[PDB]
Each structure stands twice: as C-alpha cells, then as structure tokens.
Design a protein around this nucleic acid. Structure first.
Length: 496
RNA sequence: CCACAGAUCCCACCCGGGUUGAUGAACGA
C-alpha cells in the first residue's frame, strides 16, 4: 500500500531492466521502489513539484522517463535518486513516452492535444511533430510506442484509429493504419450483392467502406477540413470501375458529391440543385447511368453519372423533396416531399403521370425495385406503402409511438422492418399490415437495412461507432403483438 | 488500388539580364 505520506496517487507501474524483484511505483508526486519479494520499500524519491502523468523505462541502466502535466520530460536515475536531464515541451500535456531502439537515440512524446513529437536525445533538438494525428476531444494520443528494434511507431487514441508511422533511411512517413468512425454512423448502405462491403457515413464527416468478411478490413473514402457531414447517401454496384457510382448530399450544401467505389475516392462530378436549394435527397438508377437530386426548394434534377451533365429537371414539389426513386426498368420515377405530395413521373418523357396528397409531411422513402412497392415515413408516425404501378396507397402501418428513424423491405417484399425514437424495431407483414414482431432496445436504432439477400440485417444506433449485424433466422406466424415485445441487447463485440 | 515521394517540365509571378545589348552569325597585326 502506498499511504499518502509515502507518496501520491499511483500513476504507473514499471519494471526497469536488471531490477530483480523490484517494482517501480510512480505516483503523481514521487517515485517509489518496492522489493516485492521482501515487501520492503527500498527507495522513495524527493517530492516532484509538478504532477507526473506518464512514465517509461529508458533503454539504459537505472533510468526512467517521467512526463508531467507541464510539458516536461524528466530523465530520472532510480539508483542515485536524482534528475539527469529535463526536456521542456512548451504548453503541452504529455500523454505518452517511448524510446526508439533501432540505433537512433530518439524519444517520442505523445500529447493530449493529439500531437506526436519526435526529439533527438543526442542532438538535443526537436526532430519533428506529427500534428493532430488523433482527435483531442477523444483524449488525443492515448498511446504511442516504437516497436522494438524497428523504425516504426504505433499510435492510437480514443477516436477509433490505430496508425503506424515509419522513419525511412527525415520526417516520419505514414505507413498503414486501421480504423472506423469516431462518432456513430449516420447513414449506411450495402455496397454490393455479394455481401462484401458496406458504405457508411458518420457525423465525424467521414465516408468509410467496411468489409463484412473475416479480415474485418476497412478503408476511409479519400476526399482528395473534411467535407460537411453527409445527410443522404446512395450507391449502385452496376457501374463500379466504369464511372462514379456513389452520390452523397452534404449538410447545408446546394450540390451533391460523387464518389468512386473502385478507387475508394471522391469522384469528378458535383450535382447542383439549380434552384438554389440544399440537397435533401439523392438516388440512383439500377443501371448506374443516372443520378437523382432532390432540392429543399422542390426541384428534382437528373444527371448523367458518366459525363456529369444535367439531363432533366422536374418541378412539382413546393417544399423539400425528401425522397426520390426509379423503377428497375427506368419507366416511372417517384418522389415525396414535406408538402405531403407523392409525385409520379414518366422517365422517358417528362410528363407528370400523377400526384397523391397524403395527410402528413413525408420524411423518407424506400423503394423496393423487385416488387415496385415503396414505403414512406410520415410525421403522423405511420408508414405508408404505395404501389408504383397503380399509383395507389396499398397499406398503412400504425404502431410506433415516436418519430420513425428508418425502415427497409425484406428482399422478397413480404416484410417491412422499421425503427423509431420509441426505442423499438418492428417487423410488419404486408399482406395483413400487422406487426408480427417487436424488439425493445436500450440503444435507439437510427438505421435498419436488409442485406440484398435476406440473410442479414444491419442496424446503426445512437451510441456506438460500429454497425450491428443481425441474423435473420426466419428465412413465421402472422399473429399480432402489443407489449409482448422482446427486450433484446445489441450483439456482442466478442463474436467472430 | 490508392497514398506519398521523386525529379523534370513548364507554367506565372519573383530576381537579375536588360534600353549602357538577347540572338545566332566561317579568323588570321
């Protein structure tokens, strides 16, 4: 036990080389040496004026490096009990220390602001500083370690990333890294029909592709200070490699961006609304030839994904267009808006084929291409299912007690699964319109998507950086439910 | 596959040239 007279609050436990049976206990105020075999406190250093936050054994005898709340790294001799050296890092709070051990006498100093500083111990000069490699709001650099005998330093923070930096035989060069979002995913989509990749956007302003396979590989989409946060997303696998196959809408921007799934990078085109409105909805044809953009001012624009050229423009809605889609045969185009209007248009000409007026503002659309049904989420907490061929409402789903966050069709077309602020995930059988299953979660689902094949369900939630995968073990009764809902927990991070 | 480098190239500024010559131009105290 370290009583408060013996030392302060324990910060770190270290074992120095050749210190047989002797544990070094560094506290906020001093450094102790205990013989763990005999129990004897064999050493206690003088009081340290400034709070010690970090400690790290040096690659030479008797020396331990100590970081302080003030940007000081102190080389301390445990045998003689005195300072040997004190390096000052101006106005930084040290969070990690590591010595290079490949021949070069270098020291790395991580900080809470997310900087990684490299210092030459022999030339007594600052070698370099990797600025903002990890987010400060997530603790900055929480750990940075030179690999033993190698010119490689591994770094990490609370921003869900693990980076590796090298020193070529010169400033350090980015080598490789792995990561995900630092904030919960806001929008997701399955990228392909082989269940390989998922496209995922977050409020951390990033666009990522995550593999669904065992290697758990992932890669951020290159934006070559980030683009504003994504507010709508669409992707089609048809033209991968040939031209742009991803469209994103960004917060408070009057144009949509395009991306290339093959090269995992932003694409060539930007698609303007043309009516000075923000982009509120985006969509793509199944063939991959066309991009659709819905404006906050009501306009709908159709662009050519190959050349980037504006093809067609429609003006029906007088409020924000919240959803757009086109049938698999590119015959009939459908739209929805906050004005509660459902628009039906002929794609080959530009004729208004029809209009529906619903009783509440419409916030989102999901179109089922294999059944030509599309569902709409309304502000009155209902889900309206419409047949695109007949241009008629065929079903209306009532049950949710709060705002609907997301929904999707089961691949066959038999089911619709929906999520809400009411912290439920419900399954609706379309032939009856009744809720046949309900799940209560403790972490509200913000997205729900069926895999192209009926096997998996992907969900995103209010808290958590990742995407939850569920197995659809019903590939069932038509009995209605009420408070017989299941209170299920999210999948384990220990699986697979 | 991207990333990043590389050097080149310009490219335009920038400087000097330069209004007290840029150019190329085949010898014979």
């Amino acid at each position: 036990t370290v009583t408060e007279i013996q030392g302060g609050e324990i910060v770190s436990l270290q074992h120095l080389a050749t210190y047989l049976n002797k544990l070094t206990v560094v506290t906020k105020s001093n450094v102790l040496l205990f013989n763990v075999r005999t129990g004897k406190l064999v050493f206690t250093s003088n009081e340290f004026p400034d709070q010690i936050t970090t400690a790290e054994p040096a690659p030479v005898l008797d020396i331990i490096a100590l970081g302080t709340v003030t940007g000081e790294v102190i080389m301390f001799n445990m045998r003689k009990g005195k300072r040997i050296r004190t390096i000052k890092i101006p106005q930084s709070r040290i969070s990690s220390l590591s010595f290079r051990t490949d021949g070069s006498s270098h020291l790395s100093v991580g900080t809470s602001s997310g900087d990684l500083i490299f210092y030459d111990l022999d030339r007594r000069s600052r070698i370099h500083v990797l600025k903002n490699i990890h987010r400060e709001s997530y603790g900055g650099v929480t750990q940075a370690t030179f690999l033993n005998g190698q010119p490689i330093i591994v770094t990490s923070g609370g921003d869900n990333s693990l980076k590796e930096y090298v020193f070529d035989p010169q400033p350090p060069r980015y080598l490789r890294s792995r990561g995900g979002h630092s904030q919960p995913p806001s929008y997701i989509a399955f990228a392909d029909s082989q269940s390989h990749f998922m496209l995922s956007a977050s409020k951390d302003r990033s666009l990522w592709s995550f593999s669904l396979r065992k290697d758990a590989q992932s890669q951020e989409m290159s934006q070559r200070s980030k683009f504003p946060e994504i507010v709508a997303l669409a992707i089609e696998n048809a033209r991968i490699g040939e031209w742009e196959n991803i469209i994103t809408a960004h917060k408070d921007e009057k144009f949509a961006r395009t991306w290339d799934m093959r090269n995992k990078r932003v694409g060539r085109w930007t698609f303007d609304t043309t009516d000075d409105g923000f982009v509120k909805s985006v969509a793509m044809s199944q063939c991959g030839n066309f991009g659709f953009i819905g404006s906050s001012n009501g306009s709908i624009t159709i662009y050519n994904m190959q050349s980037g050229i504006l093809r067609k423009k429609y003006k029906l809605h007088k409020r924000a267009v919240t959803g757009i889609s086109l049938d698999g045969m590119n015959r009939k185009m459908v739209s929805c808006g906050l004005d509660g209007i459902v628009g039906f248009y002929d794609f080959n000409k530009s004729t208004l084929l029809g209009k529906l007026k619903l009783d509440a503002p419409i916030t989102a659309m999901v179109y089922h291409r294999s059944s030509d049904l599309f569902a709409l989420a309304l502000d009155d907490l209902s889900i309206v299912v419409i047949d695109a061929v007949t241009q008629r409402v065929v079903r209306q789903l009532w049950g949710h007690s709060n705002r609907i966050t997301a929904f999707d069709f089961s691949p066959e077309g038999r089911w619709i699964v929906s999520a809400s602020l009411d912290s439920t995930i419900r399954t609706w059988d379309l032939p009856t319109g009744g809720c046949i299953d309900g799940i209560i979660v403790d972490n509200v689902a913000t997205n729900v998507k069926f895999s192209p094949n009926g096997d998996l369900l992907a969900t995103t939630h209010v808290t958590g950086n990742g995407i939850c995968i569920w197995t659809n073990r019903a590939q069932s009764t038509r009995t209605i439910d009420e408070s017989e809902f299941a209170r299920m927990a999210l999948p384990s991070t220990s699986v697979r």
